[PDB]
Design a binder for this molecule. Structure first.
Ligand SMILES: Nc1ncnc2c1ncn2[C@@H]1O[C@H](COP(=O)(O)O)[C@@H](O)[C@H]1O
Ligand SMILES: [Mg+2]
Ligand SMILES: [Mg+2]
Ligand SMILES: [Mg+2]
Ligand SMILES: [Mg+2]
Ligand SMILES: [Mg+2]
Ligand SMILES: [Mg+2]
Ligand SMILES: [Mn+2]
Ligand SMILES: [Mn+2]
Ligand SMILES: [Zn+2]
Lengths: 709, 165, 762, 245
């Protein structure tokens, strides 16, 4: 075997790896995540995966042409609200803008019905509280002109206030700093001086150094996340890169970004990779959907900490500029997705006054729950409920590499949840799982309804390590066309990273403004300006392919540009019909290509050529070929599973009844086979739960289909 | 149905965000009224039967002995027959000068009293504030609500009407 | 041959459907819903595809616009109609226009547009005429018919709020004019294109009748894009599922809507009679209201009483007998805009999870007596800021519905009502790009909301006309206005006091910058708060003006002197005024003005209103009072007087509760309330003496006199309540103010060939 | 193919004539006047019939009006134009509009009204826009193209002073407004009818944007009458004397 592509999904409870060979054959590895240094669990996952081919890490790593990292470490800080304690410096008089949420944050992520149902609206607490926010006296206008010169003493006092308040990071965002960054960078330098005198370790983040784009609400949230969520992961990629190079790799790591393409591991702006893992999942879903003919897909993934959802419609992911996610307006271009703090490690607590059950939003993560005796976890989690109810096998968690004790879950649920509520242990645990199933169901439904659809317009894909544990519950009664669990669910995001095109992309902003009809000289000058940007961006693309051992004649280049009618607030990305531009006729061809695309995106009657044109940016992409994962296509055998696929029974509790659930080894089931609930279908890193009242069947692509009976 | 506990938490303003959203976004539980009134009944310092809540501390009740229906404050005070306007039997404080408006709003944010007055209606026994009107000078006292209790109980809830003299 | 599918004319088709609705009580006579009942999977698929289509048209087409009102705030809407002009499905956004655009289609039906100018495939219609039902001229409609195999099967409407329409005043919610003449460019169901192509005479004319030409042009492309996106989707759906199924859905979806309202009323409310009222101020006597007609120079008050009846069968009725008259200002309305706004309120409380379309209008009865401000009888009235009256009347209906919810135990649904949606920052002249311009800030899309029976209202969050509130980004507003931000702050003590506090508003301080030949003005409620608190709660704060001229700020900035920044935290104890010793400052209750000259370095305060409170403030949780003071929601001095809560500042600078002193303060306030109050009979005796002596200001007397003439049942009620003798009378002519239009009026239906559509009892 | 007789577009035709005027100092480059010099009897006959026609249109059509401004005072005018928008003959009355109505025709020529919205036989145009040359909004123009065998050979314009156009001030010579915004209902070379028939959307809109609706309506019928009387007379003259003359 000649192993060529590696994809990764780190930061959850379990780190997953996905290897593709020259024929498109694949294997999946698993190991326990190691958040002090992710590289340790990544190496162990890699060895586990390659052992399925009788291969060593040494042999395979030498052959790999590319590797793509993704993970959830940064996302987990957002959804749990457990990040670095940041302070914020803004313009004096506007300290409140962040916590006001521009109003819009009171109804983001809502169903159609909840958008209009006023009493459902609600603000979540801000990323930076008001007492950790200060203001400097300064104003710069939209032209870059100083209206109010920076008063430097107010910057010094702001810095000293936030240091005395024990800030662990400081974020600076002044109005129109993207246009003229002089004043914001001087405030940065003054904050850095005061930090130095204090002796404390306090990193500083100026918005203009990271996300220099218009809209203070979006930009300020994004720059906060760079400190709050990304900064504690700053060294992870260089540790991974070194551990792999020591063991023989010759490629340069790529990372999945918010827009569904990859970037270099050396990127300074880490929040661009904040949802690398979930985006890998969506890319995987889109690829699987293209191979099998699914155009409308509702993606859904449960892990130890988060539940992630996304929509693919008419075969396309929809990339949105100035999007929202986790009820925050952001400046990162984003495939339409969302994520919430609810997972298999979520802590369960009683309200001290009402005794209401509260799930999360924080999680045990890699420490699992009270059932793992070596974890040191004292507070019960969802995983402890899984042990009580018979959802998971105590003796086959990570293939049996991590030993879980059901009796520890029984005792802790009894003391913390069941006795205080006057419930049996199994009714307390079943009640917790009822709450989870209903929360997840409503979250998935809301994503679909926010676009105006009903679930009947979609097929649901359910993946991640914990997705198949609750598919029955979170899709119940929604009316999906079909509900699908891939056999490789645990490695689905790593699969998506491996299926990504081997592409590098670079962008540059421009400011070309042109009336409808102009003399040829103006058109020649506009063309030359765009051409110079394409030549610069071409060097950036080719240099990155050189680091991977590819010379320029192996790379396919695709130039692009961003264009609009003059005065618009938004632009369109156009693929260039020309490899280079020089003449007046070339310029006319680029404006014609924009008009035609605008007609397709909107309508022919929407075109407004009488207003003239602005080019706002240049784009260059480069691609080289690699093998894609081959989706299985096996012929169907009978409806009856072989007797050798059965691996015992386990007591299973739902809707106030104990039953004997039939256990099956997932990988022993055959295409064509049907399994009637109550049953649990077990792999080494996922578990597919089929309660009484449900049924599943396995197809020739190793996809399970779930139905209510 | 929601549990009795969740309806208790709703009444107290302590309900959790998941249950509150469920209550808002899914079809209503028909059992709400009977459970709600039972919770309120258990908190009253008198045993006369609540027929319909009018406010947080204001009720139409059935008198235990006479079986007449009256408007009653939580403290026990009866204002009047259930068909009459309780406000006509209450005490009132009218804010009709700038000094009186400035007790409760900053100057400039306060209404101007030659255009709008504030009329506060109290129980005469405990001083609970049951309503605040904000009309022009000269405006009649408003009779806020005349419920069709017979129709509500028999046709919508499917319960007999409580005894009435 | 008529153009509707099957061969009926538009009028024949609608008349047949309305007659069956009247005879049976069901929309279009549909006693059963065959598609819904027999083919539920196909019914749901049409619902899903078409609702997603209209939502997608709004989300996508708004990216065409240059105006942040459309592009960022989302003040647009797209709606799909059946051949009779009844809506089936809509996007969210400014959904009052579900009703206004349908009423414009029905005007075309009823006035024989079919015969002249004709209704042809690929035609484009434009409309904004408030005499046939629209809110105001700045809401522009584009309407396109939908054809299948040469016959008409429906219509699509798209609306955008545009910055200006060339009224006397520079803004959307303009003052200055007092009549239709000067109220803006008004278009009556005009054919502006054919074969999908706009006519050049329309383009040249329209573009020179407004200030904000480039913004106008891109708002028009926005509307046509969304209309054509939806037309294409309907053609695809019909091709794939067949015209027979679509034709059934196009009427069944409306009756499904009506059934949904009826069921929700019987599940959530209580049968009975509910009585409530709202008011707002019109201070036109002030010297800074420079109107060009002397008969308009007087102070008046809007009156909107409502008798609400919920019946045993789940029908309901709203009767506005007693309301005041139209006037010489820009705050008049129309039966369509008034009743469509009540429908908007319904979508936020009764029917948010049912079909959102015209079905619920067919399930509601309305009575608006002819000649009142909500159903005027004179073709000269102005409408540019219709909302001033509209939002002030609709707020009281939340209180009535909330009494039903509260009584039944659905405490989660209670809401004390909507804020007044103002101030509207407006003005015009030359901007930073050296072009003719106007501004109209949509910061008052984000006002406070009413408190519930379970929790506080939301601050700076919504408006009655669009619950998806958005204040916009400062950096985006700065691209569209020659103004810079010196503050953006939560508005302390604006939310209505209560056990649960109403949402606060917010405020922004602006400095004029890179403007030339510039003017600005204010528009909002001043002397009167329109919302009321519920079951013991208080109204939100009312409005005021702050502006400063000849500030000397250029030199103050350069010399390092203190400069005004942030919000006007306590307007009774302001800090800004002392920083500007050379300025001409206007700080007063005059919340309505006409345009005044401003220059670079001058200041303007934009103040957005809060919402009403719930319950006795003496029952508020004491920690929530301390949290409010620490958070900037409530000024410290009101903790003791309003809530009876004793707070003190700790070592950390944070206010905390003294629980013992708070219990004692609340016990003492209960006794104070008993001592300072009087029995209601005693207070009534003294108020009756003032009524008999005619002791009230002219604005109060004019309101009652005009209301009495239009509403004899109200006059009878008032006389009975106050036990007034037959010798007491209040004729409007004896007050001493102008009364033009009190007796003589001429309705639009008196002009030749005009047939108006009736939607209410009058 | 352009719509003017011979196949030029309106703009091609006018541009050729203006260039020859500039080069020679004579209108249209006419160094001699062949019809006038060689056929003086026919020249005079066309003059006599067409001048009598325009005079008769004013004298007759004014009897339609309800407003004394038009019916008794005679504040109206009818004018005959060549294809380039230059006047040949006119009635007396408010003859400042000989120039204003020609300048409105030239605006249509120069802004490609020929391609959109089109200039078709039996169309009706209305105009009062002072930004393209009119005196004030109360002087309303009705303009009709004249065709012979499918090609454009001229235009006829008719003007009436109307009582009001719905300005802020109530009158024709109004005060109160200080800008275009409030200065009255302003119409920019609008196509208000086709096949000799006024469009209903125009009728309903126009009639509610003025105070004196009934007077407005009869002033409009006055203008259309005189325009159509003159169109008919031109068709008869061409039939009798030939298009070349
Ligand atoms: N056999 C198994 N071993 C480990 N995790 C499992 C297994 N079956 C299901 N899971 C779920 O996979 C989750 C980890 O997801 P992630 O955080 O994506 O690695 C765990 O929290 C489990 O609930
Ligand atoms: Mg994992
Ligand atoms: Mg996952
Ligand atoms: Mg939830
Ligand atoms: Mg969205
Ligand atoms: Mg006393
Ligand atoms: Mg009529
Ligand atoms: Mn509007
Ligand atoms: Mn004139
Ligand atoms: Zn009491």
């Amino acid at each position: 075997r000649n192993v060529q592509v590696l994809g990764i999904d780190a930061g959850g409870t379990m780190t997953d790896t996905f290897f593709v060979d020259q024929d498109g054959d694949f294997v999946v590895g698993k190991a326990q995540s190691t958040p002090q240094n992710e590289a340790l669990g990544l190496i162990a996952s890699s060895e586990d995966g390659l052992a399925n081919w009788g291969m060593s890490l040494h042999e395979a790593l030498a052959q790999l042409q590319t590797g793509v990292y993704s993970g959830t470490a940064m996302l987990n800080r957002v959804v749990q609200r457990k990040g670095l304690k940041c302070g914020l410096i803004v313009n004096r008089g506007m300290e409140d803008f962040h916590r006001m949420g521009r109003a819009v944050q009171s109804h983001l992520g809502y169903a159609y019905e909840d958008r209009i149902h006023l009493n459902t609206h609600r603000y979540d607490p801000p990323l930076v509280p008001r007492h950790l926010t200060r203001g400097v006296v300064e104003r710069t206008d939209m032209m870059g002109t100083q209206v109010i010169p920076l008063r430097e003493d107010t910057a010094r006092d702001a810095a000293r206030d936030l240091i005395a308040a024990d800030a662990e990071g400081i974020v600076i965002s002044l109005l129109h700093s993207y246009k003229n960054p002089v004043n914001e960078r001087r405030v940065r330098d003054i904050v850095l001086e005061e930090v130095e005198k204090s002796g404390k370790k306090i990193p500083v983040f100026a918005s203009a150094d990271y996300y220099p784009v218009r809209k203070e609400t979006h930009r300020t949230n994004t720059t906060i996340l760079e400190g709050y969520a990304a900064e504690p992961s700053r060294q992870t990629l260089s540790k991974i890169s070194n551990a792999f190079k020591e063991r023989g790799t010759k490629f340069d790591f790529r990372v999945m970004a918010t827009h569904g393409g990859t970037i270099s591991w050396k990127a300074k702006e880490l929040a661009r990779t904040i949802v690398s893992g979930p985006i890998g999942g969506v890319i995987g879903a889109k690829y699987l959907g293209e191979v099998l003919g699914y155009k409308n897909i509702a993606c859904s993934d449960i892990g130890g900490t988060s539940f992630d959802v996304a929509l693919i419609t008419q075969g396309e992911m929809t990339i949105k500029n100035d999007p929202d996610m986790a009820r925050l307006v952001l400046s990162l271009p984003l495939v339409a997705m969302d994520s919430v703090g609810a997972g298999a490690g979520s802590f369960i607590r009683l309200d001290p006054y009402t005794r209401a059950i509260k799930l999360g939003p924080d999680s045990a993560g890699y420490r699992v729950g009270v059932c793992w005796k070596e974890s040191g976890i004292e507070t019960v989690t969802i995983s402890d409920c899984h042990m009580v109810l018979g959802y998971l096998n105590p003796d086959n968690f990570l293939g049996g590499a991590v030993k879980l004790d059901r009796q520890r879950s029984v005792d802790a649920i009894k003391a913390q949840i069941a006795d205080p509520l006057g419930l049996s242990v199994e009714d307390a645990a079943a009640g917790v799982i009822e709450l989870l199933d209903s929360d997840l169901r409503d979250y998935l439904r809301s994503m679909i309804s926010g676009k105006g659809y009903s679930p009947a317009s979609f097929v649901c894909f359910s993946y991640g390590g914990a997705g198949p544990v609750h598919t029955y519950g979170y899709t119940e009664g929604l009316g999906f066309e079909d509900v699908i669990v891939p056999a490789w669910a645990a490695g689905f995001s790593a699969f998506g990273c491996a299926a990504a095109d081997f592409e590098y992309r670079y962008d540059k902003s421009l400011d070309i403004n042109m009336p409808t009809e102009t003399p040829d000289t103006d058109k020649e000058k506009a063309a030359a300006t765009l051409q110079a940007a394409w030549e610069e961006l071409t060097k950036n693309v080719l240099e990155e392919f050189k680091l991977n051992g590819y010379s320029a004649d192996q790379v396919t280049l695709q130039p692009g540009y961003r264009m609009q009618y003059r005065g618009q607030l938004n632009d369109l990305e156009i693929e260039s019909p020309l490899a280079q531009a020089h003449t007046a006729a070339d310029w006319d061809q680029l404006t014609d290509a924009f008009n035609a695309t605008y007609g397709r995106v909107y309508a022919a009657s929407a075109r407004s050529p009488e207003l003239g044109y602005s080019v706002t940016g240049a784009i260059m992409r480069g691609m080289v070929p690699i093998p894609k994962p081959k989706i299985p296509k096996e012929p169907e055998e009978g409806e009856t599973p072989p007797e050798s696929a059965k691996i015992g029974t386990r007591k299973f509790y739902r809707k106030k009844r104990w039953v004997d659930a039939q256990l099956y080894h997932m990988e022993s089931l055959r295409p064509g086979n049907r399994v009637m609930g109550p049953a649990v279908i077990e792999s080494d890193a996922t578990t597919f739960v089929v309660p009484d009242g449900f049924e599943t069947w396995l197809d020739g692509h190793r996809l399970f289909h779930l139905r209510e009976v | 149905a929601y549990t009795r506990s969740k309806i208790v938490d709703l009444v107290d303003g302590k309900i959790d965000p998941d249950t509150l959203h469920q209550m808002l976004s899914t079809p209503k539980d028909p059992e709400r009224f009977v459970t709600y009134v039972e919770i309120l009944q258990e908190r009253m310092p008198w045993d006369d039967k609540i027929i319909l809540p009018l406010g947080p501390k204001l009720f139409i009740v059935q008198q235990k002995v006479s079986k007449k229906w009256t408007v009653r404050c939580e403290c026990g005070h009866d204002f009047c027959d259930w068909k009459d306007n309780w406000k006509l039997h209450a005490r009132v404080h009218v804010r009709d000068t700038p000094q009186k408006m400035e007790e409760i709003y900053p100057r400039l944010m306060a209404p101007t009293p030659s255009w709008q007055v504030i009329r506060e209606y109290f129980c005469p026994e405990c001083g609970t504030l049951h309503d605040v009107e904000a009309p022009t000078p000269w405006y009649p006292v408003i009779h806020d609500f005349s419920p069709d209790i017979e129709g509500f109980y028999q046709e919508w809830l499917g319960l007999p009407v409580p005894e009435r003299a | 041959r008529g153009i509707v599918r099957g061969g009926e004319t538009l009028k024949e088709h609608r008349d047949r459907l309305m007659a069956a609705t009247k005879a049976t009580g069901r929309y279009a006579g549909l006693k059963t819903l065959e598609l819904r009942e027999r083919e539920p999977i196909l019914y749901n698929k049409l619902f899903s595809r078409l609702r997603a289509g209209v939502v997608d048209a709004r989300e996508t087409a708004k990216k065409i616009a240059a105006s942040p009102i459309v592009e960022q705030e989302g003040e647009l809407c797209f709606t799909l109609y059946n051949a009779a002009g009844d809506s089936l499905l809509t996007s969210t956004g400014i959904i009052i226009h579900v009703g206004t655009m349908g009423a414009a289609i029905k005007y075309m039906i009823e006035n024989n547009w079919e015969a002249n100018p004709g209704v042809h495939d690929k035609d484009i219609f434009c409309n904004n005429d408030s005499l046939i039902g629209n809110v105001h001229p700045c809401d522009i409609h584009t309407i396109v018919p939908i054809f299948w195999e040469g016959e008409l099967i429906g219509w699509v409407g798209g609306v955008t709020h545009v910055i200006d329409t060339g009224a006397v005043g520079p803004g959307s919610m303009a003052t200055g004019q007092v009549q239709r003449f000067g109220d803006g460019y008004s278009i009556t169901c005009r054919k502006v294109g054919a074969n999908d192509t706009l006519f050049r005479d329309w383009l040249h004319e329209s573009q020179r009748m407004v200030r904000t030409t480039r913004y106008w042009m891109l708002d028009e492309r926005t509307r046509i894009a969304g209309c054509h996106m939806i037309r294409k989707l309907v053609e695809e759906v019909v091709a794939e599922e067949g015209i027979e199924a679509y034709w059934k859905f196009a009427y069944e979806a409306v009756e499904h809507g009506r059934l949904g309202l009826q069921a929700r009323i019987k599940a959530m409310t209580i049968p009975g009679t509910y009585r409530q009222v709202g008011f707002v101020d019109v201070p036109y006597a002030h010297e800074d209201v420079r109107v060009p007609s002397d008969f308009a120079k007087l102070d008046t008050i809007m009156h909107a009483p409502c008798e609400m009846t919920i019946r045993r069968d789940g029908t309901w009725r709203l009767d506005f007998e007693g309301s005041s008259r139209w006037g010489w200002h820009t705050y008049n309305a129309h039966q369509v805009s008034f009743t469509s706004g009540i429908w908007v309120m319904m979508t936020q409380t009764l029917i948010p999870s049912e079909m959102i379309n015209d079905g619920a209008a067919y399930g509601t009865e309305f009575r608006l007596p002819k000649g009142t401000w909500m159903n005027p009888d004179d073709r000269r009235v102005a409408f540019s800021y219709s909302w001033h009256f509209l939002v002030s009347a609709w707020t009281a209906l939340w209180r009535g519905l909330s009494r039903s919810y509260f009584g039944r135990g659905y405490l989660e649904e209670v809401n004390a009502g909507n804020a007044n949606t103002s101030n509207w920052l407006q003005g015009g002249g030359f901007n930073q790009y050296d072009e003719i311009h106007a501004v109209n800030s949509f910061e008052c899309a984000a006002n406070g909301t009413g408190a519930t029976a379970v929790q506080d209202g939301l601050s700076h969050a919504a408006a009655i006309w669009n619950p998806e509130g958005d204040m916009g980004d400062m950096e985006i507003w700065e691209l569209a206005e020659p103004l810079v931000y010196l503050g953006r702050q939560i508005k302390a003590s604006s939310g209505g006091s209560g056990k649960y506090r109403g949402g606060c508003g917010f405020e922004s301080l602006r400095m004029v910058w890179n403007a030339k030949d510039w003017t600005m003005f204010f528009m909002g409620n001043g002397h009167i708060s329109s919302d009321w608190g519920l079951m013991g709660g208080y109204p939100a704060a009312s409005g005021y003006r702050f502006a400063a001229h000849k500030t000397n700020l250029k030199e103050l900035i350069a010399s390092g002197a203190e400069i005004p920044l942030g919000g006007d935290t306590d307007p009774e104890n302001p800090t800004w005024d002392a920083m500007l010793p050379d300025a001409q400052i206007k700080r007063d209750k005059q919340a309505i003005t006409t345009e005044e000259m401003f220059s670079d370095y001058d200041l303007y305060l934009n103040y957005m209103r809060g919402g009403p409170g719930f319950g006795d403030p003496l029952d508020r949780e004491p920690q929530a009072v301390a949290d409010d003071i620490n958070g900037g929601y409530v000024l410290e001095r009101f903790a003791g007087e309003v809530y009876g809560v004793v707070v003190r500042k700790g070592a950390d600078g944070q206010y905390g509760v003294d629980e013992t002193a708070t219990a004692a303060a609340r016990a003492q306030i209960r006794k104070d309330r008993l001592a300072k109050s009087v029995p209601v009979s005693e207070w009534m005796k003294g108020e009756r003496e003032k009524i008999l002596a005619k002791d009230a200001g002219t604005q109060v007397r004019q309101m009652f006199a005009a209301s009495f003439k239009l509403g004899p049942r109200f006059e009878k009620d008032f006389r009975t309540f106050w036990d007034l003798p037959d010798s007491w009378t209040l004729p409007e002519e004896e007050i001493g103010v102008p009364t033009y239009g009190s007796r003589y009026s001429m309705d639009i239906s008196e002009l030749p060939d005009v047939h108006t559509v009736q939607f209410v009892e009058e």
